[PDB]
Amino acid sequence: TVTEPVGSYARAERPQDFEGFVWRLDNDGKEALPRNFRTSADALRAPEKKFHLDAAYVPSREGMDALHISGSSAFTPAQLKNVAAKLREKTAGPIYDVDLRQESHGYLDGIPVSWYGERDWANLGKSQHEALADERHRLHAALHKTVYIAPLGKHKLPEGGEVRRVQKVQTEQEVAEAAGMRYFRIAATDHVWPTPENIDRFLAFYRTLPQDAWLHFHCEAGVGRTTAFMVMTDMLKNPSVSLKDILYRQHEIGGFYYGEFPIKTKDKDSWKTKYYREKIVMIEQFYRYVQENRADGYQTPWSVWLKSHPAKA
Amino acid sequence: TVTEPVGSYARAERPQDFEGFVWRLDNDGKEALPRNFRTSADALRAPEKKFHLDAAYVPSREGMDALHISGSSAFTPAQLKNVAAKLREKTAGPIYDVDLRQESHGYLDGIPVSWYGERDWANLGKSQHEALADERHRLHAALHKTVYIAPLGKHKLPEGGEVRRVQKVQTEQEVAEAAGMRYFRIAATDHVWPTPENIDRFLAFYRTLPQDAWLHFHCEAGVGRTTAFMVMTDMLKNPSVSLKDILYRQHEIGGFYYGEFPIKTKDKDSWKTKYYREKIVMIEQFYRYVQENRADGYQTPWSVWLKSHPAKA
Ligand SMILES: [Cl-]
């Protein structure tokens, strides 16, 4: 009898040790677009050296032109409108803002902020229902109140910033709709493999999407969580494509590389090591899920299948 | 018809524009004693160049040996115990911790903190009662919660610091009593001349003091408010000493110089200029009060007398 199976390591951490303490600035709004903006129509580029991949390898692009997905970091409302305009030039279908952030976030006087706790785990352990309620209450409590908004600097602690008496509060859902995008929230915890709950929710959403739906995924930095769901989407929609091809191409259009690589962390980041290893294993397990459940149309939910086919470290 | 008389300029400022936003670290606890520690028995040092005083002038020390006052910046509990032990060597009377801070403050896990708003004006406009109620409520609410405690750095904004889940909360009164000192609170606003009610309260307290009472005054930095009350006490207890001598000597033992001098602030601090000028004029006016009302035993208080004898720019 194991306490936490592979893929749920984060359940072992104590939420009370990472509670929120400051309104973190999610984007300074200086660039026209959010960071790490990329689409499945982009050309592939050389791999990042840290992943020790074969730069000579040419990944298949099979299914990429019809994939219709994109990813990015968090954004200001003006940056999201620029994203929506860009994406509109590529499709006539609905464009979804797929918010993968479990952390409570929103917009204060138009400024994208989030309630940051150590490791960005201020909502760790909360059901999506509880995380969204925390977010609604906090945002609403900010209205007409003085707040401190700051970017993280030295050692993931506030550095500089600004103080203001808030005159307007908006949720990301409102900002997405204002940019002409549909909204869908998946409360995934920063830095770790999405939970069975996160993924079951994504799969049910994916099933009823119109054929021409375009999914724009984003988290805070636009790397970990964003690439995980872009990869899952690529596997679901292009099941005949090899694992290697999916991983290389999602990485080479500008995302994270989710295959085995020499994991190296600074000493103060050594806690990330097992989460990176867990993600590598789970990516493989999700691919296996896709290959073994597509013939009957995924009658068996990911959470259920995963409990009867546990992943191995 | 004047809206705010000289000595009450601060009443024109809007409290809602300086609300508290962070638990400021009041002292890092690295030294054995708080900063700017000084007593009336100390030797006079050369004057600070910024006041453009006469370095060859030797102020009379008449009455300094019997004055029995001291001053300093904020402190950790251990630092206050060191102060008390040091002061006990000089007297056998009660030793008072005279807390001049209007800003809400206290101790979290033994760490001296204050609820800081711009210009340290988070309690601006509150009566002493409201200021102390906010204080008790914010301290208590921190118990068993996660707080961010940081020192201010560039631009008076948080820089680094720490995050912790509080296990212990104490008011300064408790900390003073644990150090064996009596406690007296005067809620004076940082950076400005103490109000007529702050001073009436102090003079009423002063009259009740036994002859051998020792007063340890302090604020946040241990300069502005601390020296103002030290000067007032010196004038009250040594009414025959000239104004020039009181001002030079309180300065030369390590305090602020409260006489006329060429004021020069950095551009970001230009708002301080009129408050400095105001203090120079009020200092003289308080000296006149003492000189005109000591002979009859202060039958009329400072606030009433000031109203009849308004100071002028
Ligand atoms: Cl949930």
DSSP H or E run through A163: strand A162-165
Distance from CA of B22 to the nearest CA of A (A): 8
Chain Cα centroid distance, residue B49? 23
Mutate to test the interface with A, among B157, B166, B167 (most CBs of A within 10 A): B157
DSSP class of residue A194 equals P
The partner residue sitting opposite A16, judged by closest CB among B20, B158, B165, is B165
3 state SS of B99: strand
CA-closest candidate to residue A124, choices A266, A1, A8, A271? A8
**What is the C-alpha to C-alpha distance for residues A130 and A141, in angstroms, rounded to an integer?**
16
The answer to whether the beta carbons of residues B40 and B231 sit under 8 Å apart is no
3 state SS of A148: strand
**What is the C-alpha to C-alpha distance for residues B313 and B311, in angstroms, rounded to an integer?**
7
Interface contacts (A, B; CB < 8 Å): 54
The answer to whether the beta carbons of residues A25 and A107 sit under 8 Å apart is no
Length of chain A: 313
- Which residues are bridge partners to B217 per DSSP? B71, B98
Q: A159 touching B, CB under 8 A?
A: yes
Q: B134 touching A, CB under 8 A?
A: no
A-chain residue closest to B153, CA distance? A160
DSSP H or E run through A280: helix A273-293
Mutate to test the interface with B, among A118, A144, A159, A167 (most CBs of B within 10 A): A159
Mutate to test the interface with B, among A17, A163, A165 (most CBs of B within 10 A): A163
How many angstroms separate the Cα of B68 from the Cα of each of A254, A296, B256, B286, B299? 71, 90, 18, 21, 25
Q: How far apart are the first and last CA of chain A?
A: 16
The partner residue sitting opposite A148, judged by closest CB among B21, B155, B160, is B21
**What is the C-alpha to C-alpha distance for residues A129 and A174, in angstroms, rounded to an integer?**
18
Q: Specify the pairing of strand B105-108 against strand B169-170.
A: antiparallel
CA-closest candidate to residue A216, choices A252, A249, A245, A180? A180
A-chain residue closest to B23, CA distance? A21
**What is the C-alpha to C-alpha distance for residues A206 and A219, in angstroms, rounded to an integer?**
18
Report whether B220 belongs to an annotated binding site: yes
**What is the C-alpha to C-alpha distance for residues B116 and B34, in angstroms, rounded to an integer?**
19
Experimental method: X-ray
The partner residue sitting opposite A22, judged by closest CB among B17, B148, B162, is B148
Taking only residues 71 to 130 of chain A, the set having a beta carbon closer than 8 angstroms to any beta carbon of chain B reads 117-118
3 state SS of B127: coil
DSSP H or E run through B237: helix B224-237
Name every chain A residue with its beta carbon within 8 A of the beta carbon of B159.
Answer: 154, 158-160
Q: Report the number of secondary-structure helices (H) and strands (E) in chain A.
A: 9, 11
**What is the C-alpha to C-alpha distance for residues A288 and A311, in angstroms, rounded to an integer?**
10
Cβ contact (<8 Å) for B159 and A158? yes
Q: In what order do the strands lie in the sheet with B162-165?
A: B162-165, B146-150, B20-25, B111-117, B105-108, B169-170
| Residue B280 CB burial class (10 angstroms; 0-12, 13-18, ≥19) | middle
* Ligand 1 centroid, distance to A258 Cα (angstroms): 25
**What is the C-alpha to C-alpha distance for residues A274 and A263, in angstroms, rounded to an integer?**
10
Cβ contact (<8 Å) for A163 and B21? yes
* Ligand 1 centroid, distance to A197 Cα (angstroms): 6
Per-residue b or e along A53-81, where b marks 16 or more CB atoms closer than 10 Å to that residue's CB = beeeeebeeebbeebbbbbbbbbbbebbb
Name every chain B residue with its beta carbon within 8 A of the beta carbon of A19.
Answer: 145-146, 165
**What is the C-alpha to C-alpha distance for residues B239 and A202, in angstroms, rounded to an integer?**
81
Cβ contact (<8 Å) for B157 and A160? yes
The answer to whether the beta carbons of residues A196 and A303 sit under 8 Å apart is yes
B-chain residue closest to A157, CA distance? B160
Q: B144 touching A, CB under 8 A?
A: no
3 state SS of A77: helix
Matching residue, tokens 């299914």: A63
**What is the C-alpha to C-alpha distance for residues A181 and A175, in angstroms, rounded to an integer?**
9
The answer to whether the beta carbons of residues A283 and A251 sit under 8 Å apart is no
Matching residue, tokens 């899952």: A232
**What is the C-alpha to C-alpha distance for residues B201 and B187, in angstroms, rounded to an integer?**
10
What is the Cα Rg of chain B in Å?
Answer: 19
3 state SS of B30: coil
| Residue A213 CB burial class (10 angstroms; 0-12, 13-18, ≥19) | middle
DSSP class of residue A239 equals T
Cβ contact (<8 Å) for A150 and B157? yes
Q: Supply B63's token pair.
A: 């009455």
CA torsion sign for B260, B265, B270, B272 is negative
Cβ contact (<8 Å) for A160 and B159? yes
**What is the C-alpha to C-alpha distance for residues B195 and B225, in angstroms, rounded to an integer?**
11
Q: B22 touching A, CB under 8 A?
A: yes
| Domains observed in chain A | 1-28+103-170 (3.30.70.1690), 29-102+171-313 (3.90.190.10)
3 state SS of B148: strand
Cβ contact (<8 Å) for B148 and A163? no
Name every chain A residue with its beta carbon within 8 A of the beta carbon of B148.
Answer: 21-22, 158
How many angstroms separate the Cα of B173 from the Cα of each of B141, B177, B185, B253? 18, 6, 9, 27
**What is the C-alpha to C-alpha distance for residues A272 and A265, in angstroms, rounded to an integer?**
7
Strands (E), chain B: 20-25, 38-39, 69-72, 95-101, 105-108, 111-117, 146-150, 162-165, 169-170, 182-188, 214-218
3 state SS of A182: strand
CA-closest candidate to residue B107, choices B71, B149, B69? B149
Length of chain B: 313
Cβ contact (<8 Å) for B146 and A21? yes
Q: B20 touching A, CB under 8 A?
A: yes
CA torsion sign for B89, B95, B99, B105 is positive
